[PDB]
């Protein structure tokens, strides 16, 4: 939500090279969610209830 407030600001140098570590933190979160999606799609619809 904080990133959503200033998505477009992530261009300017003071904003380009100053959030990258927090950015990687959320990248890990995103990757975890993508993996959860993999776990969900592997449990296909006809196999599920």
């Amino acid at each position: 939500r904080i990133f959503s407030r200033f998505n477009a600001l992530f261009v300017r140098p003071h904003i380009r090279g100053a959030i990258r570590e927090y950015q990687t933190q959320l990248i890990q979160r995103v990757k975890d969610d993508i993996e959860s999606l993999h776990d969900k799609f592997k449990v296909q619809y006809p196999q599920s209830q």
Binding site: I27, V30, K31, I34, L37, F41, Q44
Partner: protein, 49 residues
């Protein structure tokens, strides 16, 4: 780009036209004229008895 390709291939996993194609083609080629019986909603069907 790593997670980009990850989500791209995983999005390509959603291309599951096996059962979808089976259902669509079977329904078309099977019920192409199945509802053509306009005799009545009360017919005769018996055996030797």
């Amino acid at each position: 780009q790593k997670l980009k390709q990850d989500g791209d291939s995983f999005r390509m996993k959603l291309n599951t036209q096996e059962i979808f194609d089976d259902w669509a083609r079977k329904v078309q080629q099977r019920n192409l004229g199945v509802s053509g019986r306009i005799f009545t909603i009360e017919s005769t069907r018996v055996r030797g008895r």
